[PDB]
Design a protein around this ligand. Structure first.
Ligand SMILES: Nc1ncnc2c1ncn2[C@@H]1O[C@H](COP(=O)(O)OP(=O)(O)NP(=O)(O)O)[C@@H](O)[C@H]1O
Ligand SMILES: [Mg+2]
Lengths: 107, 136
């Protein structure tokens, strides 16, 4: 039992960076709205996402889209840990590539 | 018999028609269609037939040599269906002729087509025409 352990659920917004948390839980954890946080799930995967306020959600739950859940290897009903990380730094360079199966054809 | 005056002379007498070596042209008459292959032309492979031009058709029949039957069913052998045939063409010709583009786009076109109508209205004819026109 910890204040940062929350049960994942379906989200409203489909963006891959927005994560909505109940304002009560954010105030409990002292989290600034629109700031960066880190989420850890199963195995050893973790992600960095920007949090936002959503009174619709419940305190013991957090809402994420399928992209973030896939990155975390967590299905619905699992529990994830959230940690404040406002010290995130802007990146000078990012090397990104597509996937073969999804990009088949179009070039 | 005298195929020349029967078929070719009416076909060339009026209009000055272009001709190219190796090409087959279709002449309709006598309840049948006859395909004539241009064995040779002068002064070059491309020529224009004129009234004074000589026509030689005393040779033996020539083999088809992998040529397609010009009497095969096509869109010109189907009548009374222009809207339906247009729909069928728009559904079929685009993917079959250009499957690479469709598989690259990612959109899934329909595959199930059902031609329903009274007997004698086509259906079998339309499918053969589409197949022959698309080569599928
Ligand atoms: N719309 C049409 N235009 C031109 N010729 C046609 C047309 N409909 C029928 N015919 C001719 O009539 C023949 C017989 O009709 P066809 O379309 O082959 O039968 P069907 O519709 O397949 N019969 P069924 O499958 O028992 O309902 C054709 O092969 C053509 O020679
Ligand atoms: Mg039939």
């Amino acid at each position: 039992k910890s204040p940062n352990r929350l049960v994942v659920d379906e989200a409203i917004n489909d963006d891959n960076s927005v994560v909505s948390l109940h304002p009560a839980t954010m105030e409990k954890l002292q989290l600034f709205r629109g700031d960066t946080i880190l989420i850890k799930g199963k195995k050893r995967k973790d992600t960095v996402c920007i949090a936002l306020a959503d009174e619709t959600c419940e305190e013991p739950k957090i809402r994420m889209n399928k992209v973030v859940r896939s990155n975390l290897r967590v299905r619905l009903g699992d529990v994830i840990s959230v940690h404040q990380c406002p010290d995130v730094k802007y990146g000078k360079r990012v090397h990104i590539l597509p996937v073969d199966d999804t990009v088949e054809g179009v070039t | 018999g005298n195929l020349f005056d029967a078929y070719l002379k009416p076909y060339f007498l009026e209009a000055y028609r272009p001709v190219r070596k190796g090409d087959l042209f279709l002449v309709r008459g006598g309840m049948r269609s006859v395909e004539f292959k241009v064995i040779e032309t002068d002064p070059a492979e491309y020529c224009v037939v004129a009234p004074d031009t000589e026509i030689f058709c005393e040779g033996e029949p020539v083999k088809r040599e992998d040529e397609e039957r010009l009497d095969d069913v096509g869109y010109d052998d189907v009548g009374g269906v222009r809207k339906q045939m247009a729909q069928i063409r728009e559904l079929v010709e685009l993917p079959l002729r250009h499957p690479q583009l469709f598989k690259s786009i990612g959109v899934k076109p329909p595959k199930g087509i059902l031609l329903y109508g009274p007997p004698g209205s086509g259906k079998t004819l339309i499918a053969r025409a589409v197949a022959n026109e698309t080569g599928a």
